[PDB]
Amino acid sequence: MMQKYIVYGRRLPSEKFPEPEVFRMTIYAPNEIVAKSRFWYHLKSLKKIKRTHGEILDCQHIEENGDFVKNFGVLLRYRSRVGQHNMYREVRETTSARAMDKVYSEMAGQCRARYHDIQIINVKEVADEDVRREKVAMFTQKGVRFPHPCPYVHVKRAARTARFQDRAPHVPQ
RNA sequence: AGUUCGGCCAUCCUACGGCGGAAACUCCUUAACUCGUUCCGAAUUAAGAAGAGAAGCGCCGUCAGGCCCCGCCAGUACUGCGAUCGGAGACGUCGUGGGAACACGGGGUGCCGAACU
């Protein structure tokens, strides 16, 4: 469950730099405290400005719409147990904040990489004609059909309350 | 502009070329006296005033060596505190604080104080 934030920051004005340059970044985080932490994390590494020498001008939460389905491409770098690697991933979602949740869960389940081990380089929306991965592509077509992937779950779920039954229920398909 | 006496002790040092002296400082001339050199008036002591910018000295120059300031190196190397974070270990990572060095690039190259001329 992520949100998306726009954060503004600047180094405190000095005598030889009365009006320092301002920097803007886009952050996905579960709350604004984490958002500011990550902002300072990147500003220290890229611009040599620490939290102690700078100030945050504004952390504004932005809510998307979320009606149709879009294809998102995510470029990231993560550190494993043997160094660092780049990675491109494709996700299908209604919002960019919801796509980040899917990406993070997939990275946790498949690569064993946690939130603070990952750096999101860029997030963009991709057209149906320039999809790179086969799953998203096969779901972008028209008139796509398939049977229910796990109909046993409905029958299993109802047996938890009705412990003893007079016949074995069938699985409709 | 110069000399005597100083403060801080290279932005003031070292090498090599060049410019200058009216006054000043200096180099210079002599060995009766004074004092002097393991031997030597070289040094030093005493007594002078024919010469001189050739040195010392003051100033200028050098894609100069050195010395000094700023940047970059680099939020890198290293590190204080917290973590049932990863790993068989060796070691690494995250959060929260501090933060270099060499190298390289650009520029610079004595002021201050008291007395006399």
Automatic annotation (TrEMBL):
<keyword id="KW-0689">Ribosomal protein</keyword>
<protein>
    <submittedName>
        <fullName>LSU ribosomal protein L18AE</fullName>
    </submittedName>
</protein>
<comment type="similarity">
    <text>Belongs to the eukaryotic ribosomal protein eL20 family.</text>
</comment>
<dbReference type="GO" id="GO:1990904">
    <property type="term" value="C:ribonucleoprotein complex"/>
</dbReference>
<dbReference type="GO" id="GO:0005840">
    <property type="term" value="C:ribosome"/>
</dbReference>
<dbReference type="GO" id="GO:0003735">
    <property type="term" value="F:structural constituent of ribosome"/>
</dbReference>
<feature type="domain" description="Large ribosomal subunit protein eL20">
    <location>
        <begin position="70"/>
        <end position="124"/>
    </location>
</feature>
<keyword id="KW-0687">Ribonucleoprotein</keyword>
<dbReference type="GO" id="GO:0006412">
    <property type="term" value="P:translation"/>
</dbReference>
